[PDB]
């Protein structure tokens, strides 16, 4: 029952600060360092630093000796990490971590806090059909939806309100030069179904309250 | 981040070079790391005994005997040096299977999109293995460079394949200047490249 519970995701503009929290329970808070670890999207783990909650003292890794302030509040069993003067390359998942009882390895991790740093503003997607080819069948056709020009992540895509799951691939979003994301979702279906069966991609972008139901049909 | 393909039931050894005690972690996507090995050779709690840690000199290893599907993950080493912790670069272990060719599809831009001045042309490569594939866009038989972006799925849980999308982005004006749009795909499972094409407006 050692538990480490972090604060929620933050979308930030360059120049801003963010202070991430890590609430500890199930052990004596002052007995252990609280570590912080960074993981940029699709990249490795990096040790940032740590705080001694008994005396308040912090240590910082060489790479994190600027713009990082790590603290602890004994009375609420909460550790914090403040990141100042944020930059797009600060985009990462940040973890708090405590060592094992009987060794110095990091046995206990928080769930992570996603910090996204971008100059982009909230923006809902446009949804366009990837219509099934007229040359289909073989026997299998592909179709899909292009979900273009949104911020921030994520979008959800379902097919036929969740009834169609077989053969669905929803790709990772790509960041465009504009600073907006784009994503494709595709499904393969029987060619024989195309004249009969309705295919709808159900797209939700909660940050902009955008909900789109796009029917995808053979082009005439 | 190194990439290693392993056939189920085969053995892999990951090396981490460094200058006391080495630690190792397993991490899967959208999860926190799990402590895996501590004190160079001691398994962490709940870790299958088919994993083993070792070290000698400056060379530290994590061996997976008789790999199982659930061992597909990224692994990291971790050590104390001087006045800080250092994590090594990850090693991502994937499942090796028989070569499977992609099924290739091309999609023209929608009329809806074109009415606002951009054309996205999409090429889908579906359910292939291994992950390495080459997509070449051609527009009226001129090879394109610098106007496409691609995305790849994680390995499928059932068939251990990948899928890939490539999107070619043109202005409407540029799209309307040309007739033939073609995606040429090369892959180990394709004896010669596969081309899918359409004529604008057909």
């Amino acid at each position: 029952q050692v538990q480490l519970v972090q604060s929620g995701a933050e979308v930030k503009k360059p120049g801003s600060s963010v202070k991430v929290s890590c609430k500890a329970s199930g052990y004596t808070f002052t007995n252990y360092f609280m570590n912080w670890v960074r993981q940029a999207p699709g990249q490795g783990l990096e040790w940032m630093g740590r705080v001694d909650p008994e005396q308040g003292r912090a240590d910082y890794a060489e790479k994190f000796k600027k713009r990082v302030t790590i603290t602890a509040d004994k009375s609420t069993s909460t550790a914090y990490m403040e990141l100042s003067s944020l930059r797009s390359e600060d985009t990462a998942v940040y973890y708090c971590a405590r060592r094992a009882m009987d060794n110095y390895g990091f046995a206990y991790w928080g769930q992570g806090t996603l910090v996204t740093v971008s100059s982009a503003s909230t923006k809902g997607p446009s949804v366009f059909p990837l219509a099934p080819s007229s040359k289909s069948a073989g026997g299998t056709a592909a179709l899909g939806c292009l979900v273009k020009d949104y911020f921030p992540e994520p979008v959800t895509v379902s097919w036929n309100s969740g009834a169609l799951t077989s053969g669905v691939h929803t790709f990772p979003a790509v960041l465009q030069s504009s600073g907006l994301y784009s994503l494709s979702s595709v499904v393969t279906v029987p060619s024989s179904s195309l004249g009969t069966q309705t295919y709808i991609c159900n797209v939700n972008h909660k940050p902009s309250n955008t909900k789109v139901d796009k029917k995808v049909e053979p082009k005439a | 981040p190194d990439f290693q393909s392993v056939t189920p039931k085969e053995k892999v050894t990951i090396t981490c070079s460094a200058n006391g005690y080495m630690y190792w972690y397993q991490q899967k996507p959208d999860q926190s790391p799990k402590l895996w090995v501590h004190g160079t050779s001691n398994l962490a709690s709940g870790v299958p005994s088919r994993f083993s840690g070792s070290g000698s000199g400056t060379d530290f290893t994590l061996t997976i005997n008789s790999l199982e599907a659930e061992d597909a993950a990224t692994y990291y080493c971790h050590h104390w040096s001087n006045t800080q912790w250092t994590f090594g670069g990850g090693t991502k272990v994937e499942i090796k299977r028989t070569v499977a060719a992609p099924s290739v599809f091309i999609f023209p831009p929608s009329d809806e999109q074109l009415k606002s001045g951009t054309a996205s042309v999409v090429c889908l490569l579906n359910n292939f293995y291994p992950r390495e594939a080459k997509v070449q866009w051609k527009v009226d038989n001129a090879l394109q460079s610098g106007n496409s972006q691609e995305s790849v799925t994680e390995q499928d849980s059932k068939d251990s394949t990948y899928s890939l999308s490539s999107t070619l982005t043109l202005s409407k004006a540029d799209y309307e200047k040309h007739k033939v749009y073609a995606c040429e795909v090369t892959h180990q499972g394709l004896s010669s490249p596969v081309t899918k094409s359409f004529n604008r407006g057909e």
């Binding site: 252990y32 360092f33 001694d52 008994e54 240590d59 110095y104 | 104390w80 001087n82 006045t83």
Partner: peptide, 9 residues
């Protein structure tokens, strides 16, 4: 502190 664990500081 130049050690890997608080109990050594």
């Amino acid at each position: 502190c130049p050690f890997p664990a608080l109990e050594l500081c």
